Design a protein around this nucleic acid. Structure first.
Ligand SMILES: [Mg+2]
Ligand SMILES: [Mg+2]
Ligand SMILES: [Mg+2]
Length: 116
RNA sequence: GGUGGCAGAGAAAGGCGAAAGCCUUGUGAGGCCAUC
């Protein structure tokens, strides 16, 4: 149900980046708080898992991100996404709120996301 | 308890059970507010 294919090296970079931002910035795990952050203009980068069932849970997020000028990327499993964020290791979506020390790796990854 | 609104937790909570253990929880546990 993805809107564009994300190659594995980008998914790997996105998740490694989320692990680092966890340490010095601010992350939100879960679709209700991810959606809220997007709507409030506070999300820097949104992660959407591809194995979300029922898929309607995350179906509105890509469009809302585009309307809010928020870049978003898909990753393979909500388990990988949850583990990268920490805490309870499952999440259908997540958002970076504060970039911490990773502004340059994030901007470089979003450049690649637009390239797709 | 119903409805509406917050917030965000797994070395974690609440539910059921004599017990074994099971159920539910970032797909939102406990909690808070308003309202019926
Ligand atoms: Mg009810
Ligand atoms: Mg309800
Ligand atoms: Mg509600």
């Amino acid at each position: 149900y993805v809107r564009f294919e994300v190659p594995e090296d980008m998914q790997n970079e996105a998740l490694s980046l989320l692990e680092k931002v966890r340490e010095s910035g601010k992350v939100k795990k879960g679709t209700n708080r991810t959606t809220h952050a997007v709507y409030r203009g506070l999300a820097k980068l949104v992660y959407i898992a591809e194995d979300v069932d029922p898929p309607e849970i995350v179906a509105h997020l890509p469009l809302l991100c585009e309307e809010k000028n928020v870049p978003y990327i898909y990753v393979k499993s909500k388990n990988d996404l949850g583990r990268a964020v920490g805490g309870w290791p499952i999440g259908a979506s997540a958002a970076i709120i504060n970039e911490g020390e990773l502004r340059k790796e994030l901007g470089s990854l979003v450049e690649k996301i637009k390239g797709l």
